[PDB]
Design an enzyme around this catalytic site. Structure first.
Site, PDB file in Angstrom:
ATOM      1  N   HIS B 102       0.801  -1.226   0.000  1.00  0.00           N
ATOM      2  CA  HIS B 102       0.000   0.000   0.000  1.00  0.00           C
ATOM      3  C   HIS B 102       0.837   1.281   0.000  1.00  0.00           C
ATOM      4  O   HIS B 102       0.423   2.309   0.537  1.00  0.00           O
ATOM      5  CB  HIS B 102      -1.047  -0.020   1.152  1.00  0.00           C
ATOM      6  N   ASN B 175     -10.113  -3.140   2.891  1.00  0.00           N
ATOM      7  CA  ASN B 175      -9.838  -3.116   1.439  1.00  0.00           C
ATOM      8  C   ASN B 175     -11.177  -2.959   0.750  1.00  0.00           C
ATOM      9  O   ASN B 175     -12.215  -2.881   1.429  1.00  0.00           O
ATOM     10  CB  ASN B 175      -9.212  -4.439   0.958  1.00  0.00           C
ATOM     11  N   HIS B 366      -3.194   1.011  11.863  1.00  0.00           N
ATOM     12  CA  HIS B 366      -2.888  -0.376  12.279  1.00  0.00           C
ATOM     13  C   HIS B 366      -4.155  -0.997  12.890  1.00  0.00           C
ATOM     14  O   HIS B 366      -4.719  -0.374  13.769  1.00  0.00           O
ATOM     15  CB  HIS B 366      -1.737  -0.349  13.312  1.00  0.00           C
TER      16      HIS B 366
HETATM   17  C1  HEM Z   1      -7.540  -8.547   5.568  1.00  0.00           C
HETATM   18  C2  HEM Z   1      -6.354  -8.494   4.992  1.00  0.00           C
HETATM   19  C3  HEM Z   1      -5.613  -7.143   4.906  1.00  0.00           C
HETATM   20  C4  HEM Z   1      -6.123  -5.914   4.702  1.00  0.00           C
HETATM   21  C5  HEM Z   1      -7.598  -5.508   4.473  1.00  0.00           C
HETATM   22  C6  HEM Z   1      -5.020  -4.964   4.719  1.00  0.00           C
HETATM   23  C7  HEM Z   1      -5.103  -3.586   4.532  1.00  0.00           C
HETATM   24  C8  HEM Z   1      -4.006  -2.752   4.509  1.00  0.00           C
HETATM   25  C9  HEM Z   1      -4.041  -1.343   4.224  1.00  0.00           C
HETATM   26  C10 HEM Z   1      -5.336  -0.648   3.776  1.00  0.00           C
HETATM   27  C11 HEM Z   1      -2.804  -0.824   4.349  1.00  0.00           C
HETATM   28  C12 HEM Z   1      -2.384   0.676   4.103  1.00  0.00           C
HETATM   29  C13 HEM Z   1      -2.720   1.555   5.351  1.00  0.00           C
HETATM   30  C14 HEM Z   1      -2.304   2.953   4.889  1.00  0.00           C
HETATM   31  O1  HEM Z   1      -3.007   3.514   4.024  1.00  0.00           O
HETATM   32  O2  HEM Z   1      -1.232   3.426   5.349  1.00  0.00           O
HETATM   33  C15 HEM Z   1      -1.939  -1.901   4.786  1.00  0.00           C
HETATM   34  C16 HEM Z   1      -0.581  -1.782   5.045  1.00  0.00           C
HETATM   35  C17 HEM Z   1       0.212  -2.733   5.604  1.00  0.00           C
HETATM   36  N1  HEM Z   1      -0.159  -4.043   5.839  1.00  0.00           N
HETATM   37 FE1  HEM Z   1      -2.077  -4.863   5.665  1.00  0.00          FE
HETATM   38  N2  HEM Z   1      -3.851  -5.651   5.011  1.00  0.00           N
HETATM   39  C18 HEM Z   1      -4.166  -7.022   5.126  1.00  0.00           C
HETATM   40  C19 HEM Z   1      -3.282  -8.093   5.372  1.00  0.00           C
HETATM   41  C20 HEM Z   1      -2.024  -7.938   5.931  1.00  0.00           C
HETATM   42  C21 HEM Z   1      -1.188  -8.957   6.536  1.00  0.00           C
HETATM   43  C22 HEM Z   1      -1.594 -10.455   6.721  1.00  0.00           C
HETATM   44  C23 HEM Z   1      -0.079  -8.358   6.968  1.00  0.00           C
HETATM   45  C24 HEM Z   1       1.138  -8.956   7.680  1.00  0.00           C
HETATM   46  C25 HEM Z   1       0.957  -9.972   8.541  1.00  0.00           C
HETATM   47  C26 HEM Z   1      -0.125  -6.946   6.621  1.00  0.00           C
HETATM   48  C27 HEM Z   1       0.903  -6.051   6.853  1.00  0.00           C
HETATM   49  C28 HEM Z   1       0.912  -4.735   6.423  1.00  0.00           C
HETATM   50  C29 HEM Z   1       2.005  -3.847   6.599  1.00  0.00           C
HETATM   51  C30 HEM Z   1       3.410  -4.135   7.152  1.00  0.00           C
HETATM   52  C31 HEM Z   1       1.556  -2.534   6.051  1.00  0.00           C
HETATM   53  C32 HEM Z   1       2.414  -1.257   6.016  1.00  0.00           C
HETATM   54  C33 HEM Z   1       1.856  -0.543   7.270  1.00  0.00           C
HETATM   55  C34 HEM Z   1       2.639   0.751   7.427  1.00  0.00           C
HETATM   56  O3  HEM Z   1       3.788   0.915   6.895  1.00  0.00           O
HETATM   57  O4  HEM Z   1       2.178   1.658   8.111  1.00  0.00           O
HETATM   58  N3  HEM Z   1      -1.303  -6.750   5.998  1.00  0.00           N
HETATM   59  N4  HEM Z   1      -2.698  -3.046   4.892  1.00  0.00           N
END
Ligand code: HEM
Ligand code: HEM
Lengths: 727, 727
Positions: B102, B175, B366
């Protein structure tokens, strides 16, 4: 698990292969036999995979890499799951800051060799012997956009070369035009901020076509010279293999006797100069934002190694003040008609990296990295660069030990009294960490300068003046070099420049900025200014029409080395042709087409309305590379339509649009037999047109004619005719 | 001394203006009167500029910001130039790591309010009171590409909302589809590495259309449901305003009595659901890679504030096991025909940020940030997400004080015994930094849980199982939900799904990977599988043709809420129309066009073959927004061609192409008077066509017809006709 197919088709051949023939692969697997000293020195950190157990970073074998540890198979995940946490931790921390500028870039390994010893003018070891081979790593880049932006934007390109010499790393950090936008490094954050995405909303990516850029340009005429270059087709090269390279700054060569010679660095593309056209470049940013990166990699996998000739413009110390312009002014070029480029050596890029992040993204080039036999000058843009590259690398690469990251390491000895810092790899055994010391008999020791293997000593240039923040008055001329560039261009190049200015200024929301730029153009050339004004609905005033043109450059009105095209240099090897198939192709046509292209090292891609195979008139089974929509005419250099059951595709809008797009972008098209039915889509007259190859069959002179057109790159005479076609 | 013009036209009016009418600007200057508690609390760090002296960061006024300090005006730059070094140092260190996923995203401020108190099902303070408003900051994103990649890629989209509540930040990190690709967080790095650019050459950006992704998919059939969503038009939304949002996981609501209710979160776009078509989306990545970013910022500047309705699917705890899928499986959706979405509140996005980097790039969302009244479940994907967001933020934002970065700060009280860390802003005066303490009488103190303003206590879920790395058997079904989704789509949406899979798989170099994916499709639906196979030149085997279709989902053979379009929900406010001008436009047409557009809040862009002005038949001066080529039909919803001097544009290639592209892309076209002569380039019907509005003049009736078509978004009935057109 045992997951690969039994035929061994998951694995590309470890042999040169044309683009699209096999899956691309890490360089050391694709070309295991292609070696050089630097590539060999990296063996110590190369990690294999095949036949190894999957482990943590601590070497503990993992049994189940599909699941977290939980209390019950539907239960909560447990904090004791160290395998999950190490795995997500590493993933969570994969990213590092991208480069502040030139974030987008593509890189390869190669080697350089001089044609003859340059000992008479420089003691630089890598230039001392034609049999001395220097490993290089090269990265080409755009300028504004992030690491995930598109390749074929209109932008200056970076051309950076790390030479791993026996007396130290020399980085030659240049661009694809011979001047820069600004004169003094203090303004670099202002210029870069103006060209980058605007700070409230971070738009636009990869484009100078917005208000702040043109606002800055309008207020800083020193920029106009490089802006002319950017608006020309120079700003949209066909590929990194077909653009020139320049160090921009005057540097010094220093010989063993202590003589300083002024030098500007050139790279000449041995494949020739070639650019896209704007509509094609822009569309390509959508259809394949990785086009240049892909083209570079596949050329190397194919054996079309990018080759460049290093050349020096050399000026005696006594001639420093003999030009209308200041040698130290990086907004001014040195016209080849005044000072020829002397050929120095050849650089061949012959191996792709194994891992893009480890080798490309972490590579660090800095123009302060020079070697005995070279030196700087007081060019005020260069002078500030020397501060910046060292500084930025400390955050980008996480501390002062970035030279220990494998791609960055010298191949030659490095010893000193520096210690510690984050990520320290070298374990020093010297009892001493300071000099002078007696406890290690003062080792490692300083070395006096001398003809070879000597210590670095700066050339003793005289400095005289007061401490001032002041632009030299010699730098205060802004229009004659733009005009020199303009007058050297072909009529179709000039039109492309007009069109570039016109398109960019149309994206500027504040009309007064457009007016201001047009006013600047009127100081350069009235015809240029009028044509851009007309495109913007602006009328020049009587005062603007009367602005006297800037003086010639040392008596030069034009210099044809400044044109991409005015002197042909058309190499066809490594170029690519779309072949549009039908379901009963004339197999005789296809034998003739494919063999003629292969004989010249020109690649082909067989396109159809679907994937799979088609069968030719005689039962030959033809594998389909891509669909018409999948590999558009944007990605090729010419198009051939063989004879057969044309009714199969004459009705296919995609097939027609393929030709119309290729036609609009001035690409050679060849139609064999009934393929000539497509003449009507592109409004070709019965008798024919220069730039359209047509015959009853692909035999005889058909392929020689098409190849002749491909050598001339594009069909410039077609320009008046494209205005009408709806594509 | 380089100053602004006379008219004050350097500056955008601080009132709502339609897109293209004024330059965009920072939110607090565009809309100074738009406030909320969070936007107000950011005032401590807002930094103005007008009438202030230019300084170093240490507050020292700079005299000459054009030059480095040098010894003589052509001399070397001096080390003592601290003004240059500060300025370059700050420039050199501008970048921070982009998000691992993202990275590409666009954000805005706004506010949320519930329709009624939800205190019977949840004690969450932000849902307790219909008159109580909660500030939000929302970031929309793609998934794969870097921060500089294009907006209109085919990708899942992110929809993250930070609620600044009186009892804590709650981040709802969702999402635009109701499921994810994988079941257990442990596989996330595998899935993400497979979809990201391949590691040898870092290609392709922003695209799943490459071998590694389809390799992973073919070996992990749990991915097929979200892959179905991605290949449909859901993967290329028109605008962030016109897609749905979902929290995906089952979470809990906890009321004051202790009762748990399972909940899934939904956002409903009040502007309706709308998507691009693939050819349009891919071309737009080239013509405007910032399209969604731009569209969001411009809608807000125009007063077309994005509005979404928060909705809950609620399942009693005793119904946990009552479906034929596991509620804790994030690859399974809960069909609205089984469990309806209860309306909960409205969110309105009404101000853009001031500085993209400071507020968007540094925002940290988060899903672990919950508040009393909410809780987790054992969904094994959600469970590992809880580890990852905290962890990645430590490197991305430079340390554990990321909550002190202004955009991230709670508006409610925060007090605890944590201290230090890089960039610590808070200066703690508490004599104690530990508890229990007597020296500060134990403040700040723990708070028992209770109905309002109480401490967080986890719902005391019963846990029973052995410590296992094991997937729940109940998760081991992969085909029924993909099928339910497929059968719920309209025939044109099914076609587009087929085309998505066919396009992507044709870019997969290893043919067996294509074959294996087609094999998986045969486990979902044979019609789907056969249509893709045909495009790929693959023939299904006898066994494949006899694979039993998966069971219905709890008796459902379709659920129309899964279709973008099956149920009309179109809303024209905020859409945009291209108006193709000529040099003698019939002002009576233009008056009637603009009056009708204005009444429904539809914007217009006036286009011509050059910039500047054209004068209508009645003397009205019309400023030109952009050229036919500069703002292509890709960027608009419909095209109108008024009458006037049609001869002016009738033979213009770009004008004709404009209509042919809008036609191909299913957009409504309206042609008045002699503009009807353009019916010939779109080569079809003369009695007329549903989708093409036509009359002697543009009037009330003409505009009503055109606006009705716009309400239905695109002209699906024209699909059979577009195959032939060469555009
Ligand atoms: C239901 C499944 C998931 C959804 C709906 C989702 C949604 C998102 C969204 C919308 C963002 C961007 C937030 C922003 O705009 O800054 C993001 C970032 C991120 N996601 Fe998830 N994600 C999912 C699954 C996962 C999984 C399984 C992991 C790791 C175990 C993960 C790790 C991360 C990380 C490391 C970021 C970067 C966060 C940051 O740098 O601040 N995601 N995710
Ligand atoms: C003659 C004018 C210049 C040329 C030809 C030039 C060329 C380049 C090139 C090719 C790169 C990318 C190297 C790579 O591939 O990693 C680069 C990066 C960079 N440039 Fe320059 N540049 C110029 C001016 C300047 C100036 C005036 C400054 C600042 C004083 C500057 C600061 C930087 C920085 C901070 C980077 C990123 C370096 C890194 O992260 O490793 N550049 N430039």
């Amino acid at each position: 698990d045992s997951l690969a197919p039994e035929d061994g088709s998951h694995r590309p051949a470890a042999e040169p292969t044309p683009p699209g023939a096999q899956p691309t692969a890490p360089g050391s697997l694709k070309a295991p036999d292609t070696r050089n000293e630097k590539l060999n020195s990296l063996e110590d950190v190369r990690k294999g995979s095949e036949n190894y157990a999957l482990t943590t970073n601590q070497g503990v074998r993992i049994a189940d890499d599909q699941n977290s540890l939980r209390a019950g198979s539907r239960g909560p995940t447990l904090l004791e799951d160290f395998i999950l946490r190490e795995k997500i931790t590493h993933f969570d921390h994969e990213r590092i800051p991208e480069r502040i500028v030139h974030a987008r870039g593509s890189a390869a390994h190669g080697y350089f060799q001089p044609y003859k010893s340059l000992s008479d003018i420089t003691k630089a070891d890598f230039l001392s012997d034609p049999n001395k081979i220097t490993p290089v790593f090269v990265r080409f880049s755009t300028v504004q956009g992030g690491a995930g932006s598109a390749d074929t934007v209109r932008n200056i390109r970076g051309f950076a070369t790390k030479f791993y010499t026996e007396e130290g790393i020399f980085d030659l950090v240049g661009n694809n035009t011979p001047i820069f936008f600004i004169q003094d490094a203090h303004k670099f954050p202002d210029f870069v901020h103006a060209v980058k995405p605007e700070p409230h909303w971070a738009i636009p990516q990869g484009q100078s076509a917005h208000d702040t850029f043109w606002d800055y340009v309008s207020l800083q005429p020193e920029t106009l010279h490089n802006v002319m270059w950017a608006m020309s087709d120079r700003g949209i090269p066909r590929s990194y293999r077909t653009m020139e390279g320049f160090g921009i700054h005057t540097f010094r060569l220093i010989n063993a006797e202590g003589k300083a010679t002024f030098v500007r660095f050139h790279w000449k593309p041995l494949a020739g100069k070639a650019s896209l056209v704007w509509d094609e470049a822009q569309k390509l940013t959508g259809r394949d934002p990785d086009f240049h990166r892909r083209e570079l990699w596949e050329a190397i996998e194919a054996g079309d190694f990018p080759e460049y000739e290093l050349g020096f413009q050399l000026i005696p110390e006594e001639d420093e003040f003999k030009f209308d312009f200041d040698l130290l002014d990086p907004t001014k070029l040195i016209p080849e008609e005044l000072v020829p480029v002397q050929r120095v050596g050849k650089m061949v890029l012959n191996r792709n990296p194994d891992n893009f992040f480890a080798e490309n993204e972490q590579a660090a080039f800095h123009p302060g990295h020079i070697v005995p036999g070279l030196d700087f000058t007081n060019d005020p843009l260069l002078q500030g660069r020397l501060f910046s590259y060292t500084d930025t690398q400390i955050s980008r690469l996480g501390g002062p030990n970035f030279h220990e990251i494998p791609i960055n390491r010298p191949t030659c000895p490095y010893h000193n009294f520096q210690r510690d810092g984050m990520h320290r790899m070298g374990i020093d055994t010297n009892p001493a960490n300071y000099e002078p010391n007696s406890i290690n008999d003062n080792w490692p020791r300083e070395t006096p300068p001398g003809p070879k293997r000597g210590g670095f000593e700066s050339y003793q240039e005289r400095v005289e003046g007061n401490k001032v923040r002041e632009r030299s008055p010699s730098f205060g001329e802004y229009y004659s070099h733009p005009r020199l560039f303009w007058l050297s261009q072909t009529p179709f190049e000039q039109r492309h420049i007009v069109d570039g200015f016109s398109f960019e200024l149309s994206k500027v929301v504040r009309p007064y900025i457009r007016e201001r730029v047009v006013d600047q153009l009127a100081h350069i050339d009235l015809t240029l200014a009028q044509a851009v004004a007309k495109n913007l609905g602006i009328e020049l005033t009587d005062d603007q029409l009367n602005i006297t043109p800037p003086p010639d450059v040392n008596g030069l009105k034009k210099d044809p080395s400044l044109s991409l095209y005015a002197i042909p240099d058309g190499d066809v090897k490594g170029r690519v042709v779309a072949i549009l198939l039908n379901d009963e192709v004339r197999s005789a046509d296809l034998l003739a087409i494919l063999k003629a292209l292969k004989a010249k090292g020109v690649h082909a891609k067989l396109l159809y309305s679907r994937m799979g195979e088609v069968t030719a008139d005689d039962g030959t089974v033809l594998p389909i590379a891509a669909t018409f929509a999948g590999a558009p005419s944007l990605t090729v250099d010419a198009v051939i339509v063989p004879c057969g059951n044309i009714a199969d595709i004459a009705d296919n809008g995609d097939a027609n649009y393929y030709l119309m797009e290729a036609y609009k972008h001035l690409k050679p098209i060849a139609l064999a037999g009934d393929a000539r039915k497509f003449k009507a889509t592109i409004k070709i007259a019965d008798q024919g047109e220069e730039g359209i190859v047509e015959a009853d069959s692909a035999d005889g002179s058909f392929m020689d004619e098409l190849l002749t057109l491909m050598a001339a790159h594009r069909v410039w005479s077609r320009i008046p005719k494209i205005d009408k076609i709806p594509a």
